[PDB]
Subunit: 197 residues, 10 copies
């Protein structure tokens, strides 16, 4: 069963049950057309790096919505395990309330479509996908289990894609808002390389 | 032809001609055993984001070498084109001298083995790979063409993997050195969750 | 992927992580050679009929051990979800403590080997298997999700198999301990049919 | 040739000759639409557990008919052998007159469609199937040859499915009519768990 | 599954349980090596032409034994049905005691091997086979269901094959013991033909 | 090339050149619709058992024609050899003039169609087929080469079929015209079995 | 099944029963090693051109024996028909006695190996083969049915082939013994073409 | 690639360039419809037997035209070699002028269609075909290289085939015009065999 | 993937980005319809024989244009490398301004289509192709890496094909404009050959 | 049958009959090891461009032999046609006596091995191959039929290869003996490119 997630192609469609504001709702990738989506997998509810990452994105959710960007998290756990996790206090590795949908990939179909399913473990690694508003996949970040992801880096990449979507100039290594960009032409490129070093 | 690059498996072997310090030398993935390796692809010599990524890394090479980590870059261009690029002043979108190897992948074999090859274009996307001292692939970062990578994020990741190798603990979202870590078990985990609240 | 569970054949081998007396232990089907095992699947932790069944068997576990019979339960949930379920009080649909291993079938491999995996739902139906001490599968009970199983019936079947294992006489409809049995021979059968009605 | 019998799918269609009230009649699964059906296989006419199961059910037929439920039995024997069996006094391991149909499966087609056929023996094992009024298969009970089934368990099951059809609630372990039921959702479920404790 | 029965080839091997003198004995084709065997199939116990054929051969069995010839009958019925049939008085279409083995072919393998099986009915047609003391198949007689076979004709054939086995002669149309035979060569044949005419 | 001759299915169609009344005529199985047909193969013209069988049937043809039955013979010999044999005196092993058609099967298509062809010998064995007036195969008699068939047995068989065709009673072993028949149902079978025999 | 007759390749091996001076003898191709063999097929015994050819050859058999050549005729007809045809006076289209073996090919395998079999007719055409003392096929003459072959032409060819075997020189169009030959080289060819011709 | 030359079937179609009276003309098999055609292959231009045959035929071409027959020779040689061979004096192994078309088969397809191609030699053997006015193949003569063909035999055959076409009677062995023929039926065959012969 | 380049067949279609007069233009084979095209591959920008060949043709380009002939060069290098090569002074192995299109074949499709690709090296050998105004491929010249091509020879060939295109003549060895030509038929050819000698 | 001729791999092995010094000799590619070999195919003997190419090379053979080079010619014509052409005066389009071997490829195996065979015409096109002393193919020149090759260009090519073989410098476009060469590295390439040209 092959990974269908390819950069510059439509992100593999998905649909399933998620926990949104304490309730079970059906959620579809297509529900986010018009916005940038940060769609990310994490291994297991009731473990360790996993609460911290969901909390880090949830706590800073306004930074994303402020740039027309939603966030959705997902693991192979059921919607009932998600809801129990949410209902466990952060003190006991629970999540406590949260502002980001927790999608359920019980059948493992979505994980396989995104190429993050670990056949020997029965869950995903840490895979994060940045999908733009046309539904096109733009970025893929895959981390071995031990190492969590970074909201700042994710923020930077979304802003970079939105910028380059708007202007057609390109974003140099380390680019942040306000940084120099490059006209992607053999002559126009010299406005950047000549100006700075 | 399919990507052989899988997290927690040995990175796909490669060898080829690289420009090292103005000279052609035969470089092998295995020459880096014993050290961490940031192995990264970029589209085309004499383009745009491309020099700025190589420069960014090369110019900060010591922040990697000071943590037992090397950096190698790669494109489908020939070694002759790499050298001419290096021999082009930075002011014209050249690299000027550079301390990180430029590996050449004319046959596209390496790009295909790493699953970064773009069939419709004849070059790669922005693909970065973090390979540990034991040769195991730990992190995969893939960017669509317009958006460059970040030396700082790469550094944070390398540091995180080195930490969790050493202490067998796990790094939460956004972990930078000095940040709180977690002990991977339902019991001992609570010394972090009763501490962050 | 075909069901390997066939009556009068060795029960499909399994191994995985279970929660035994609050801890993660590796458990193997073979660990129960010498005893009758009641091995049963249930859909999801943090649901409804599922706690009641585990509780019904756990509370009456001594009735099984007293006849050389162990009980193991299993669902597609992780060992971390199991342990959280156990650590949720029975008042909130939790299990509270329990004396029966909760096996984890995260990869779905065991469920598929036993032919209880629901491809569209991502979990099992209510399947119960009675495996004797030689490791041979003797009985299969499969219930659609809404309807729970019965400890009394399970008790009856185990006793019936143990009896018939010992004596070679056969167990008539409705048989319980102390009931009439039948010599499985065209002549010897008449000691039963002649004697009663 | 594989079993077509799947829980929550329409029971595999069958038809054939049955002895009904001393006569040969053509019986179809579809003749039972509108009623629940206990459809059960047994090994061989003129054997042992076999008459006692048929008698047990037939003699208690009204406990099923009083709840809109029929009972049909089946073996690989011919209709001529079924009738001769019925025409054998119970005192000789016959059935004497019987009110439940004996379906004949000489071609083994039905036994194979239900996955109860024993290739090495040329007859079935003890297989029982509970099919609802809409024709959907709800319960599968398979016994190795020495051990008979239970009318009481069958009755409890039929009653349970009829209840959960009507009230869309779910039946806990051991549910007999009049027992507490559960409302299937993480909220309303607690009116049973805060009640049983 | 195709007929393995070929004239002048060794008769297809067979074995199974038979009722020999009211007892269940295991019977193999090879047990009859050294004697001629009349091996015949009939459709169903407790039917019509069927008892009369077994009886006809059973009553005249010494005529066969006195020429080193055995007789075995076979149907798809179980050995248990065979025995009940034997224990049924002839006046009710039973067989009463019988000296011919009744072989059971529940699995339908023997019938398929002898190409006498009816897929649409689930039992055999009227097939009879004459197998010599070397186990070579010599004669195949197949009748549609409603016409019974002939003991007289069967005897004549056995005698003729025994005859042509012992002598360098062939048996003309209608040959019975005592009749003119032919020497099978162009010269010797004329001692028969000139004489006859 | 496998045999198309199945009992109670239409007899494999055939056509070819037959010697009739000294002349070559085209002859077709369908020419015999409305009549019963005894169609039989024999090995080789100018052999031994062969002419006696053709003569036995020819000389007694009226016993067949007076019961709406024809007889046709066939071997792999050419029509010219057939004729040459017919023009050989009976005393030299010829047929002399003959009243039954001799069909020619040089290509072996017909023999192969009837499963009577010997691949190792290049001619048929002794195969006789009884085809009713509706063209349905009713009976197959196959003899190894050394033993001729019987006109008396063939007559009995033809009469038996004609009779069950007409009366829908069935024929017991050894049934000759005027013998007791049986009504084919489990109740009317007692007319024949009680005191009647 | 394809033809194996290839010029300058070994003639396809054959064996079978033949009529040699009124007797049935097994005959092998390898029996003629050392001698030249004219090997011809004819359509059918008891027909037309076919007798005249065999006689035409058989009468002049001496001219072949005085040049180390043997002859064998073959048809699809049985040995028994062959013998009958010989014992038929020439005046009635028979052969009368004959020195030329008549080989029998009932199975058709020999005709098929020699590419002379007529699938639609069931016998061969007029096919003649010239085989040298070392068993290599040297000549193939195939005639449509209506036209017979020539003893003289066959004699010319056998001689031509014998001459070129010895002298290693080549035979021009229309070569009969004593005629002028040609030396097979572009120098020694002028001896024939120039001054002489 | 297999031979398509089949007697009594249409001669395989052909076309190509030929040398007809010093000129290059496309030539088709269908060009000879209405006339008999002797069509022969020869190994090579500028060799040995090959010129004598073409001359042998070409000189006597009249005897073929006075019986409605044409002739065409063919080799694997190019038209340019054909023409050069014609413009080579007969005294130097040339043909000198010639009335017989020399067909060219450079591609070898025609030789392969006629089964005369020698795979190991790269040219044909001595193969001759007689084709009637309706384009049906009537005769195939194949010679090994060293032996040439006979104008007289070819003439006998063309006449024989023309006679049997008209009169519908058959030609005995060694038939030249005016000779006694045979009527193709077992009655009218006695006119030839009896009293006359 | 096999070479599609066949002489006298239409040249394999191609398109891609080329540097035409310092700009990136999209170029198709079909753009040259109506003119002759010299289409040539060279191994690598910034190498050795490579600049000299492009220069040689570039400098003498009017000699081609003045005969309705274009020239295009192609390597596996990117259009960006092409432009930098053009912008590199000839004194450092660059091309300086160039009037010949430089076509880019990054995907290797065009090179594979023209069978000039080296799988082991990742670039082409020295392949040159002459394509006429109808787009038919007329000439293929392939050189191993170390030997350069000849503008003079290339011109002679283009002129010769143009010549033989316009006139019913062929060009002998070494032909240049002005030289003797040959009339390609057996008669007319002699005006050339008798004259020359 | 695909072409085996690959540049810088060993030249497809070949062997056959060649006309040498008026006589037929067996000739093998390996006979030329140690020498460079110009091996070239031409369409057809007795055509037009063909003799001029053979004559041009033959008459200037010493220019090849004085540089350790041989020349061999080959077409699909037979060795007898080769000879006949050699014995044709140059004034009639013949070769007259000749000093280069004329190889014969009647079976086309050699032409096919070299990818020069025209399936539609049955002869080759104008294909020339330059094989070094180590038997490695160095150069392939293929011309459509109307244009002859050049002895001067072939000489240049042979000299170029001999020179790079010897000096390990590379040959620029139009290199003739005594012209400037280039050292094949990115630094020593400046010796040739600066002021040197
Ligand atoms: O350059 O992106
Ligand atoms: O009978 O079990
Ligand atoms: O008799 O069926
Ligand atoms: O003939 O038997
Ligand atoms: O020149 O490579
Ligand atoms: O011959 O061109």
């Amino acid at each position: 069963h092959l990974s269908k997630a390819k950069i510059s192609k439509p992100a593999p469609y998905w649909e399933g049950t998620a926990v949104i504001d304490g309730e079970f709702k059906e959620l579809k990738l297509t529900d986010y057309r018009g916005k940038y989506l940060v769609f990310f997998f994490y291994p297991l509810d009731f473990t360790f790096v996993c609460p911290t990452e969901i909390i880090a994105f949830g706590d800073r959710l306004e930074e994303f919505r402020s740039i027309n960007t939603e966030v959705v998290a997902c693991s192979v756990d059921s919607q009932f395990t998600h809801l129990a996790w949410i209902n466990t206090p952060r003190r006991q590795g629970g999540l406590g309330p949260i502002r980001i949908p927790l999608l359920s990939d019980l059948t493992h179909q979505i994980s396989k479509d995104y190429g993050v399913y670990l056949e020997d473990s029965g869950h995903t690694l840490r895979g994060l996908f940045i999908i733009d508003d046309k539904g096109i996949l733009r970025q893929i970040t895959l981390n071995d289990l031990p190492v969590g992801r970074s909201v700042d880096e994710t923020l930077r990449l979304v802003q970079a894609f939105q910028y380059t979507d708007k202007h057609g100039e390109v974003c140099p290594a380390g680019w942040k808002p306000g940084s120099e960009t490059i006209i992607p032409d053999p002559a126009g490129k010299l406005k950047y390389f000549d100006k700075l070093n």
